[PDB]
Amino acid sequence: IETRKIPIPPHRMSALKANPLVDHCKLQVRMNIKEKRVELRSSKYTVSNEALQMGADFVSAFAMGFDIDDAIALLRLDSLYIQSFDIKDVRQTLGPDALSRAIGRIAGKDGKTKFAIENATKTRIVLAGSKVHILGAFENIGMARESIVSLVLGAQPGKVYNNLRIIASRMKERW
RNA sequence: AGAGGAAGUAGGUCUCCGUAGGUGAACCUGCGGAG
DSSP states (O other): OOEEEEEOOSSTHHHHHOOOHHHHHSEEEEEETTTTEEEEEEOSSOOOHHHHHHHHHHHHHHHHTOOHHHHHHHHHOTTOEEEEEETTSSOSOOOSOHHHHHHHHHHOGGGHHHHHHHHHHTOEEEEETTEEEEEEOHHHHHHHHHHHHHHHHTOOHHHHHHHHHHHHHHHHOOO
């Protein structure tokens, strides 16, 4: 019998108050968003370390910014992965015009560029300053990774988008 | 002005916060800060 306790950000707390995980994976939950903790306790109906770990990864992802839909998608699909990427990792220039210019290049106005990337490589990301959080199958995650590191290198968004399109297409092909 | 003659050229998204206004709890808008 094992228990996992997870801290939350103050951002998502109303959505956390919005609702079921005991029904989902038979694992008793306590919540206290004032100590920012969520307790996940294995009952006699909880069977697997797999179930505890997926509940933990799921609540951490929903806390880290994705919503209930891709969240229960991550719940449902054990193939799906998560990755947290800081913009402060490997860095092309030491100038601290990094964050503003870079994440402007990432989103574009109205999230056009990020959303084109989403509809291309079939992932789900969220952008908040230094962190970007990426969700889905790891190879798509890696394509998006190479895309974004090229974008923060400064490549033309349409150009890297085209390359991303064709690479995603040949990935999506089987033979 | 005149018919003739004769030639040549053809790129800040999402969440949260602090603001000002709106129709007020909420909520919307805009500004300014954090993830």
